[PDB]
Protein backbone atom coordinates (compact mmCIF):
# COMPACT_ATOMS: atom_id res chain seq x y z
CA UNK A 1 0.00 0.00 0.00
CA UNK A 2 2.79 2.38 -1.03
CA UNK A 3 1.91 4.40 -4.16
CA UNK A 4 4.13 3.92 -7.21
CA UNK A 5 4.04 7.68 -7.79
CA UNK A 6 5.60 8.32 -4.37
CA UNK A 7 8.56 6.04 -5.10
CA UNK A 8 9.04 7.54 -8.55
CA UNK A 9 8.86 11.04 -7.03
CA UNK A 10 11.53 10.14 -4.46
CA UNK A 11 13.74 8.76 -7.24
CA UNK A 12 13.20 11.91 -9.33
CA UNK A 13 14.04 14.15 -6.36
CA UNK A 14 17.29 12.26 -5.78
CA UNK A 15 18.07 12.38 -9.52
CA UNK A 16 17.65 16.15 -9.80
CA UNK A 17 19.62 16.65 -6.56
CA UNK A 18 22.49 14.61 -8.01
CA UNK A 19 22.36 16.56 -11.27
CA UNK A 20 22.40 19.87 -9.37
CA UNK A 21 25.44 18.66 -7.43
CA UNK A 22 27.08 17.66 -10.70
CA UNK A 23 26.53 21.11 -12.20
CA UNK A 24 27.24 23.49 -9.31
CA UNK A 25 30.47 21.88 -8.05
CA UNK A 26 33.84 22.83 -9.56
CA UNK A 27 35.58 19.85 -7.94
CA UNK A 28 35.86 16.72 -10.05
CA UNK A 29 35.40 14.58 -6.92
CA UNK A 30 32.04 16.18 -6.15
CA UNK A 31 31.11 15.78 -9.82
CA UNK A 32 31.78 12.03 -9.54
CA UNK A 33 29.79 12.01 -6.29
CA UNK A 34 26.83 13.66 -8.04
CA UNK A 35 27.11 11.15 -10.88
CA UNK A 36 26.90 8.33 -8.33
CA UNK A 37 23.81 9.97 -6.80
CA UNK A 38 22.22 10.21 -10.26
CA UNK A 39 22.83 6.59 -11.23
CA UNK A 40 21.71 5.35 -7.81
CA UNK A 41 18.50 7.38 -8.14
CA UNK A 42 17.83 5.87 -11.57
CA UNK A 43 18.46 2.38 -10.17
CA UNK A 44 16.05 3.13 -7.31
CA UNK A 45 13.46 4.17 -9.91
CA UNK A 46 13.95 0.81 -11.64
CA UNK A 47 13.56 -1.01 -8.31
CA UNK A 48 10.33 0.90 -7.57
CA UNK A 49 8.96 0.09 -11.03
CA UNK A 50 9.89 -3.58 -10.68
CA UNK A 51 8.31 -3.81 -7.23
CA UNK A 52 5.08 -2.26 -8.52
CA UNK A 53 4.78 -4.86 -11.29
CA UNK A 54 5.92 -7.74 -9.07
CA UNK A 55 8.81 -8.69 -11.36
CA UNK A 56 12.49 -9.49 -10.89
CA UNK A 57 13.30 -7.25 -13.88
CA UNK A 58 13.62 -4.17 -11.67
CA UNK A 59 16.24 -5.83 -9.48
CA UNK A 60 18.04 -7.20 -12.55
CA UNK A 61 18.20 -3.69 -14.03
CA UNK A 62 19.40 -2.52 -10.62
CA UNK A 63 22.19 -5.11 -10.78
CA UNK A 64 23.27 -3.91 -14.23
CA UNK A 65 23.02 -0.29 -13.05
CA UNK A 66 25.31 -0.84 -10.08
CA UNK A 67 27.77 -2.82 -12.22
CA UNK A 68 27.93 0.25 -14.46
CA UNK A 69 28.21 2.49 -11.38
CA UNK A 70 31.13 0.48 -9.99
CA UNK A 71 33.07 0.45 -13.26
CA UNK A 72 32.37 4.14 -13.92
CA UNK A 73 33.50 5.03 -10.38
CA UNK A 74 36.69 3.05 -11.00
CA UNK A 75 37.46 4.83 -14.27
CA UNK A 76 36.47 8.28 -12.98
CA UNK A 77 38.61 7.99 -9.87
CA UNK A 78 41.54 6.76 -11.98
CA UNK A 79 41.17 9.83 -14.21
CA UNK A 80 40.85 12.05 -11.12
CA UNK A 81 44.07 10.60 -9.68
CA UNK A 82 45.81 11.17 -13.02
CA UNK A 83 44.54 14.76 -13.01
CA UNK A 84 45.78 15.28 -9.45
CA UNK A 85 49.15 13.82 -10.43
CA UNK A 86 49.68 15.90 -13.56
CA UNK A 87 48.04 19.16 -12.43
CA UNK A 88 47.99 19.10 -8.57
CA UNK A 89 44.41 20.41 -8.56
CA UNK A 90 40.90 19.07 -9.11
CA UNK A 91 39.46 22.26 -10.60
CA UNK A 92 37.41 21.12 -13.58
CA UNK A 93 37.25 24.64 -15.02
CA UNK A 94 41.02 24.57 -15.49
CA UNK A 95 40.64 21.46 -17.70
CA UNK A 96 39.32 23.48 -20.63
CA UNK A 97 42.15 23.82 -23.16
CA UNK A 98 40.16 22.56 -26.18
CA UNK A 99 37.53 25.03 -27.38
CA UNK A 100 36.08 26.65 -30.48
Amino acid sequence: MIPLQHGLILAAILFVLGLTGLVIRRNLLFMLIGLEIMINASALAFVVAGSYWGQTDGQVMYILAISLAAAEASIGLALLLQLHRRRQNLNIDSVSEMRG
Binding site: L19, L22, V23, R26, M31, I92, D93, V95, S96, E97, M98, R99, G100
Partner: protein
Protein backbone atom coordinates in the same frame (compact mmCIF):
# COMPACT_ATOMS: atom_id res chain seq x y z
CA UNK B 1 25.27 53.47 -58.89
CA UNK B 2 25.17 49.89 -60.21
CA UNK B 3 28.94 49.42 -60.75
CA UNK B 4 29.26 47.43 -57.48
CA UNK B 5 26.55 44.90 -58.56
CA UNK B 6 23.94 45.38 -55.78
CA UNK B 7 22.06 42.18 -56.67
CA UNK B 8 25.26 40.20 -56.13
CA UNK B 9 25.57 41.64 -52.61
CA UNK B 10 21.87 40.99 -51.94
CA UNK B 11 22.53 37.35 -52.83
CA UNK B 12 25.72 37.38 -50.72
CA UNK B 13 23.64 38.37 -47.66
CA UNK B 14 22.84 34.69 -46.74
CA UNK B 15 26.58 33.89 -46.64
CA UNK B 16 27.14 36.78 -44.20
CA UNK B 17 24.20 35.59 -42.08
CA UNK B 18 25.60 32.04 -42.09
CA UNK B 19 29.05 33.25 -41.01
CA UNK B 20 27.56 35.39 -38.23
CA UNK B 21 25.36 32.53 -37.01
CA UNK B 22 28.31 30.12 -37.03
CA UNK B 23 30.45 32.54 -35.03
CA UNK B 24 27.60 33.04 -32.56
CA UNK B 25 27.02 29.30 -32.21
CA UNK B 26 30.73 28.65 -31.64
CA UNK B 27 30.48 30.54 -28.33
CA UNK B 28 28.84 27.45 -26.81
CA UNK B 29 32.03 25.47 -27.48
CA UNK B 30 33.93 27.24 -24.72
CA UNK B 31 35.51 23.99 -23.53
CA UNK B 32 34.00 24.03 -20.03
CA UNK B 33 32.72 20.66 -18.84
CA UNK B 34 30.24 22.11 -16.33
CA UNK B 35 28.64 24.15 -19.10
CA UNK B 36 28.37 20.96 -21.18
CA UNK B 37 26.53 19.25 -18.30
CA UNK B 38 24.35 22.35 -17.88
CA UNK B 39 23.49 22.31 -21.59
CA UNK B 40 22.59 18.62 -21.29
CA UNK B 41 20.18 19.43 -18.45
CA UNK B 42 18.81 22.43 -20.39
CA UNK B 43 18.16 20.17 -23.37
CA UNK B 44 16.50 17.62 -21.11
CA UNK B 45 14.19 20.33 -19.74
CA UNK B 46 13.42 21.58 -23.27
CA UNK B 47 12.71 18.08 -24.64
CA UNK B 48 10.49 17.10 -21.70
CA UNK B 49 8.59 20.41 -21.75
CA UNK B 50 8.02 20.04 -25.50
CA UNK B 51 6.79 16.48 -25.00
CA UNK B 52 4.29 17.51 -22.31
CA UNK B 53 3.15 20.49 -24.40
CA UNK B 54 2.48 18.52 -27.60
CA UNK B 55 0.92 15.51 -25.86
Amino acid sequence: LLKRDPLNSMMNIPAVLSRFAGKGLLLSENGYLRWYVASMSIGAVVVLALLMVLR
